[PDB]
Design a protein around this ligand. Sequence first.
Ligand code: PUB
Ligand code: PUB
Ligand code: PUB
Ligand code: CYC
Ligand code: CYC
Ligand code: CYC
Ligand code: CYC
Ligand code: CYC
Ligand code: CYC
Ligand code: CYC
Ligand code: CYC
Ligand code: CYC
Ligand code: CYC
Ligand code: CYC
Lengths: 176, 176, 176, 164, 164, 164
Amino acid sequence: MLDAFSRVVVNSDSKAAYVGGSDLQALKTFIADGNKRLDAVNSIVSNASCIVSDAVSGMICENPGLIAPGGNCYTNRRMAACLRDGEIILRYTSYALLAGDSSVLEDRCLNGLKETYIALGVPTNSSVRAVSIMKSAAVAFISNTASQRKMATTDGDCSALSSEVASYCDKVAAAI
Amino acid sequence: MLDAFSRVVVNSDSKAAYVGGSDLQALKTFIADGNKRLDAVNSIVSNASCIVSDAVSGMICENPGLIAPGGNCYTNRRMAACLRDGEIILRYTSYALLAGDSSVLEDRCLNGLKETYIALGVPTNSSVRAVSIMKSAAVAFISNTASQRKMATTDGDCSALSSEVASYCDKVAAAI
Amino acid sequence: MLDAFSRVVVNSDSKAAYVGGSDLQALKTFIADGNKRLDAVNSIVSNASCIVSDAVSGMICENPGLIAPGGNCYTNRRMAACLRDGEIILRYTSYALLAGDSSVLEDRCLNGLKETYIALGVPTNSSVRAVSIMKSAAVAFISNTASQRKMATTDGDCSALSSEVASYCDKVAAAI
Amino acid sequence: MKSVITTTISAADAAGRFPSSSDLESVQGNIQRAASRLEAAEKLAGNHEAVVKEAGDACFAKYSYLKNPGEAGDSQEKINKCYRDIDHYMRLINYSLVVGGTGPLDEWCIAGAREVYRTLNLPSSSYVAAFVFTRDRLCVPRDMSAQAGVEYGAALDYVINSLC
Amino acid sequence: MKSVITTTISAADAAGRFPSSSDLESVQGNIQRAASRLEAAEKLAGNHEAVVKEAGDACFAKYSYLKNPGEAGDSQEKINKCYRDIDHYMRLINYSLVVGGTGPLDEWCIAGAREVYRTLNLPSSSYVAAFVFTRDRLCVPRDMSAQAGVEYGAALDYVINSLC
Amino acid sequence: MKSVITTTISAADAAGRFPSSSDLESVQGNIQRAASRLEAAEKLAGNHEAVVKEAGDACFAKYSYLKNPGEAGDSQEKINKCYRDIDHYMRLINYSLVVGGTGPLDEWCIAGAREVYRTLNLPSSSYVAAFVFTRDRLCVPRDMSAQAGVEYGAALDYVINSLC
Ligand SMILES: *[C@@H](C)C1=C(C)C(=O)N[C@H]1Cc1[nH]c(/C=C2\N=C(C[C@H]3NC(=O)C(CC)=C3C)C(C)=C2CCC(=O)O)c(CCC(=O)O)c1C
Ligand SMILES: *[C@@H](C)C1=C(C)C(=O)N[C@H]1Cc1[nH]c(/C=C2\N=C(C[C@H]3NC(=O)C(CC)=C3C)C(C)=C2CCC(=O)O)c(CCC(=O)O)c1C
Ligand SMILES: *[C@@H](C)C1=C(C)C(=O)N[C@H]1Cc1[nH]c(/C=C2\N=C(C[C@H]3NC(=O)C(CC)=C3C)C(C)=C2CCC(=O)O)c(CCC(=O)O)c1C
Ligand SMILES: CCC1=C(C)/C(=C/C2=NC(=C\c3[nH]c(/C=C4\NC(=O)[C@H](C)[C@H]4CC)c(C)c3CCC(=O)O)/C(CCC(=O)O)=C2C)NC1=O
Ligand SMILES: CCC1=C(C)/C(=C/C2=NC(=C\c3[nH]c(/C=C4\NC(=O)[C@H](C)[C@H]4CC)c(C)c3CCC(=O)O)/C(CCC(=O)O)=C2C)NC1=O
Ligand SMILES: CCC1=C(C)/C(=C/C2=NC(=C\c3[nH]c(/C=C4\NC(=O)[C@H](C)[C@H]4CC)c(C)c3CCC(=O)O)/C(CCC(=O)O)=C2C)NC1=O
Ligand SMILES: CCC1=C(C)/C(=C/C2=NC(=C\c3[nH]c(/C=C4\NC(=O)[C@H](C)[C@H]4CC)c(C)c3CCC(=O)O)/C(CCC(=O)O)=C2C)NC1=O
Ligand SMILES: CCC1=C(C)/C(=C/C2=NC(=C\c3[nH]c(/C=C4\NC(=O)[C@H](C)[C@H]4CC)c(C)c3CCC(=O)O)/C(CCC(=O)O)=C2C)NC1=O
Ligand SMILES: CCC1=C(C)/C(=C/C2=NC(=C\c3[nH]c(/C=C4\NC(=O)[C@H](C)[C@H]4CC)c(C)c3CCC(=O)O)/C(CCC(=O)O)=C2C)NC1=O
Ligand SMILES: CCC1=C(C)/C(=C/C2=NC(=C\c3[nH]c(/C=C4\NC(=O)[C@H](C)[C@H]4CC)c(C)c3CCC(=O)O)/C(CCC(=O)O)=C2C)NC1=O
Ligand SMILES: CCC1=C(C)/C(=C/C2=NC(=C\c3[nH]c(/C=C4\NC(=O)[C@H](C)[C@H]4CC)c(C)c3CCC(=O)O)/C(CCC(=O)O)=C2C)NC1=O
Ligand SMILES: CCC1=C(C)/C(=C/C2=NC(=C\c3[nH]c(/C=C4\NC(=O)[C@H](C)[C@H]4CC)c(C)c3CCC(=O)O)/C(CCC(=O)O)=C2C)NC1=O
Ligand SMILES: CCC1=C(C)/C(=C/C2=NC(=C\c3[nH]c(/C=C4\NC(=O)[C@H](C)[C@H]4CC)c(C)c3CCC(=O)O)/C(CCC(=O)O)=C2C)NC1=O
Ligand SMILES: CCC1=C(C)/C(=C/C2=NC(=C\c3[nH]c(/C=C4\NC(=O)[C@H](C)[C@H]4CC)c(C)c3CCC(=O)O)/C(CCC(=O)O)=C2C)NC1=O
């Protein structure tokens, strides 16, 4: 896996170049927003249970066939497997947020996920709905706009980080 | 794997239904014929060597190319592998007869058999011939009409069980 | 794997025949040239480092893109992997020369090599060039016509053995 | 699906054996016990609505706090789902009684249940209360025969122990 | 196919080694012993019909019971198959003598033989009788040279020991 | 690519854990040390041509025998490749300084280096001489700050130890 720094290095290596001043400036921006990035990650991991269970429950209450006989969330075994998948996906998204790069998510989570879900019969449309609910939840916790829990931070602008979180969730939805 | 009872349960679960009285009646019929089913299985397993070696030998005496150079029964290694396959197939058929359901045979024996035989070069036509000879032999032993061995049972009608044995052998032939 | 003798036996077995006098004569020819065959193998294995490093270096000096960023020999890891592949191929070619049959090479080295190289991104054209340079080098060492090293043998004609070495290298090039 | 039949056949299959005497004897046991457990299954399937209703009533009578806001039964839809869950369990017990083993329960209700109930704030004690009430409410021979009750109570005890 | 050559090459391959001195020396041994075993192979291939006939005759002369009904030689076709089998074995020995190892025998006659002969009621003692007769009938130098006979008898002994 | 970030994330991933306090603290360390190592990286990237030239000069001044026929620097193209190699190493060090770990060096220069240099008759002592010269030539604060030099010298020492 790569982080934001090794991503810059790989791109530079493509040209056999030393890291350009422009890239160094961008990385210094990443450093300057480091504390905000850590608060962003803390806000997601500290509410991971809330995020995942609310997203799976929302997916189901919008499509109750999922819990009818034959539904892919029918029986406790399947519901447990689906809650576990929601948690795993959120975990890899939080790794991408901590690292500032989506390689960890693409390589260790998404690579082969589509085929696996086809093989198992997991509905992709329901999966994307769970992931987009988690996306809205995670963005809210980054921006500290969740209705029922607040996380005290010093005032400022974390729009870039929430946009990043959303872009990772979008990669997940696109891959399946 | 499923037996006749769990088969009924899986079918009922498809409708989120408690087991219907009609199904309970059928299962009670299965119970009532239980002793006949056990005699049927005993009659096959007690003559398994006879069944398999006679069926492989018949397959060969009808197609002697099998034992010419290049034939798939040529050399002792191949003949031994083919006798072993005949025995394995009969064993899974006897499991299906004991359980009253073909799931054990389909899942643990037939799943992938066709592809495997294509990969190895085992002739499917010769295989079906060995299996249909075993089918006739097994049916005879169920109905106690084998010429050279008799098995003493109390008199009655085991046509349903022989028909079941034949249906399992037919699944084997169909799968390859 | 097969050698020249077991190759004759497999061919004879195809006809359920005892080994024909014609085949026995040919094998006796193989025996008569045994010492030459051993000198041939000694001449390759005693110069394996020279052969492989000269062939990989030649491949690169004819196509310097291989060592530019993005080239499949770029970084020490890739160059080391490529020197290792050159050595492995030469090793299997020397086994084929010792055995007098190409089965060892086909089965333990070439089977699947093309697909593997496609999967990894190793350029097949550059590979064939390295192999054909090794071919010329190996033939020279068999015929004792390498410019910079001589190997003292009793005078005679090893054209058949060099032709054999070349035919094995050609199998390698054809397979990829 | 765990049963006498599947257990014996899988044992034979692992050793590559044809059925022998012990396998046939096991199935004979299935024949012998079928009468009592099929009676229990039939009794349960013919009256499950009243049984489920009584069980859910017992759960909420014992745990009124479940109806407080933020708790598992704080809305009518959630109460309905509670009775539905109890229904699912009674249905799986019906299946276990028909199969003669705990397979349907193990695969369709117990596996993963703890992860689900913890993520959903569903207290295990509530399900246990529903099943304990059902076990204690059984009346012999009013509701079924003695041995039918042994089978029914055993399946209920198995469920309860799974939640312990 | 087990031979000096394949054994040495496989050893080198397992260790990822080029051929070295010991591998070349092994092949030299193959060169040295080739004369005697190729002589034995050539003698066998030029007279196999009489050898097989004599061997099968010895088997049935020693075991007349094989011709009883229900036994392996109770019909002419089965007797013919017996002589055919002996022929196959002599051919595999011819192959073993040419290769210089037991590979052709091991893979084409010995592997699986016991399972076949037990399922087909073919007593091992009958094949052993045919091979013992052949081994004892060999006459030196009438039939082949001393060392050719060492190779021929060794292959026969290997077959016999495989059936022991 | 070995870094503080990737090391911590991989540790968490192996245990199936979300990031927790220790992971965030590790990244905080990356933030803290970034200033010195990015300064060293920037200084190196802005003057690498003179650094490489000096290093290669030191290698050939210490080992004149490299220019003898049959040796690694016996032609102008081979000398040029020597300076190119030193350039590659300085670039990888620049990358290591930016990433904050030895990952770029480990994967792109060290892995397989010994096999390459032995097959190509490139003496390890020559590269070590180039890097030792570079390490000893560093002047503080003329060339960079104290802590920037700690980072630069540490990467050089890591390369040298890889060749030991
Ligand atoms: C977790 C316990 C939560 C806390 C704390 C909180 O304050 N809000 C919860 C998390 C959360 N969820 C969202 C967004 C959505 N959640 C959805 C599922 C719910 N919607 C339903 O109809 C049901 C009924 C069973 C459920 C479970 C849905 C849908 C969304 C909207 C997704 C979208 O497309 O925008 C949010 C973010 C914004 C919001 O307040 O809705 C948060 C913080
Ligand atoms: C096993 C030792 C047997 C006993 C005991 C016995 O009484 N009969 C043996 C088993 C048996 N086999 C069949 C049916 C067939 N067996 C066939 C093979 C034989 N036919 C040949 O030409 C040869 C000569 C080498 C062999 C080995 C064939 C063919 C059949 C017919 C299959 C079909 O399509 O109907 C039976 C059942 C009925 C019967 O008596 O034939 C039994 C009990
Ligand atoms: C190994 C150290 C060698 C000794 C000893 C020796 O006397 N010759 C070396 C081995 C050798 N190589 C060949 C054939 C070729 N080697 C090639 C690569 C070189 N050609 C280049 O342009 C470069 C410059 C960096 C390299 C490394 C090439 C090309 C060939 C020709 C291949 C062909 O298609 O014919 C030979 C055999 C004949 C010969 O002397 O060239 C030998 C013994
Ligand atoms: C076929 C086998 C099967 C079982 C056993 C099962 C249990 C089960 N009950 C659920 C929901 C639920 N189940 C309950 C039940 C309860 N309310 C209370 O007051 C009590 C504490 C408790 C029961 C004693 C509730 C409240 C929910 C909704 C939880 C929520 O969305 O907040 C869910 C999550 C999906 C859904 O909303 O339907 C599962 C998987 N599902 C199955 O397919
Ligand atoms: C590398 C990270 C990783 C991922 C992503 C992963 C996914 C994953 N989910 C699985 C199963 C499953 N996954 C689900 C999930 C859901 N069902 C629905 O209806 C929902 C829409 C959906 C949410 C995505 C379900 C129900 C199963 C069980 C399938 C079954 O039991 O038939 C399985 C098969 C093995 C198992 O049952 O656990 C895998 C491999 N495993 C991993 O290690
Ligand atoms: C151990 C892991 C770790 C954490 C968790 C951490 C938090 C942290 N966040 C900070 C600032 C800050 N944190 C935020 C974050 C945000 N403000 C908002 O209004 C947004 C909703 C919110 C979304 C993430 C902002 C805007 C600042 C001030 C600007 C900055 O210093 O980066 C600071 C610097 C000032 C201070 O609080 O002393 C720290 C140390 N530092 C660490 O090393
Ligand atoms: C190329 C190597 C090779 C070998 C060695 C070989 C042995 C061999 N002999 C067979 C048959 C047979 N072989 C015999 C031989 C015997 N009759 C006797 O009286 C003696 C006891 C005995 C020999 C000493 C007989 C009788 C059969 C027919 C058995 C039957 O169908 O009842 C069979 C079963 C297939 C067939 O009917 O041809 C094999 C595999 N097959 C091969 O491909
Ligand atoms: C799950 C149960 C199961 C099955 C069904 C099974 C089949 C099976 N039969 C095989 C081989 C073989 N199978 C046969 C069988 C026959 N040749 C003929 O001419 C006859 C028509 C035919 C009878 C079907 C032969 C000859 C081989 C050896 C192929 C060879 O050596 O080249 C192999 C490859 C490995 C081996 O040689 O043993 C498999 C996997 N293995 C299992 O575990
Ligand atoms: C341990 C395993 C086991 C076996 C083996 C078994 C056999 C068994 N077979 C029985 C009856 C019977 N068995 C048969 C079977 C058949 N009659 C025919 O003419 C057909 C050819 C034949 C083919 C299978 C029949 C018809 C009956 C009488 C009807 C019945 O009781 O089911 C009975 C009941 C009466 C008695 O014999 O005491 C037993 C106990 N019971 C067991 O528990
Ligand atoms: C990006 C990381 C990277 C590194 C580090 C690297 C090293 C490297 N230097 C090479 C060549 C070479 N490198 C040298 C260098 C030297 N000449 C001397 O006098 C000194 C002893 C010595 C350096 C101190 C020479 C002479 C060659 C040519 C060797 C030959 O072809 O004979 C080669 C073989 C391919 C080629 O000819 O270019 C590699 C892989 N390649 C890479 O991609
Ligand atoms: C059975 C014998 C055998 C063979 C044949 C073999 C080939 C082989 N070469 C590999 C890699 C590799 N192979 C090469 C070779 C070369 N790159 C070029 O530009 C040259 C043209 C070319 C020479 C063929 C390279 C560069 C890699 C590394 C690929 C990478 O790191 O991205 C790999 C992947 C694993 C690894 O990196 O070592 C295999 C399996 N492995 C074996 O065990
Ligand atoms: C331990 C492994 C082993 C080796 C290495 C070996 C070498 C060996 N090579 C020989 C002859 C020979 N060797 C060669 C080989 C060649 N002559 C040329 O001019 C060609 C360039 C060259 C290319 C290979 C020739 C032509 C002969 C003479 C003809 C012959 O005896 O086969 C001889 C027989 C005469 C003698 O030297 O005593 C031996 C023992 N013998 C062994 O047992
Ligand atoms: C699936 C198995 C099953 C269970 C568990 C079950 C429970 C059960 N027992 C009931 C009644 C009853 N059950 C009893 C119990 C008893 N009566 C006596 O003679 C005994 C002395 C005493 C306990 C030992 C009594 C007294 C009633 C009627 C009074 C009441 O509704 O509480 C009712 C109300 C419906 C009705 O009146 O029939 C249910 C649902 N019904 C079933 O089918
Ligand atoms: C493949 C190797 C091989 C064997 C095993 C073999 C056996 C063999 N020995 C025979 C003859 C014979 N073999 C002998 C044996 C002996 N003659 C002496 O001078 C000795 C004193 C004495 C034993 C030490 C004798 C006396 C005969 C002729 C009498 C007879 O047919 O029994 C015959 C009859 C055909 C013929 O007359 O030549 C066969 C088949 N032939 C072969 O090619």
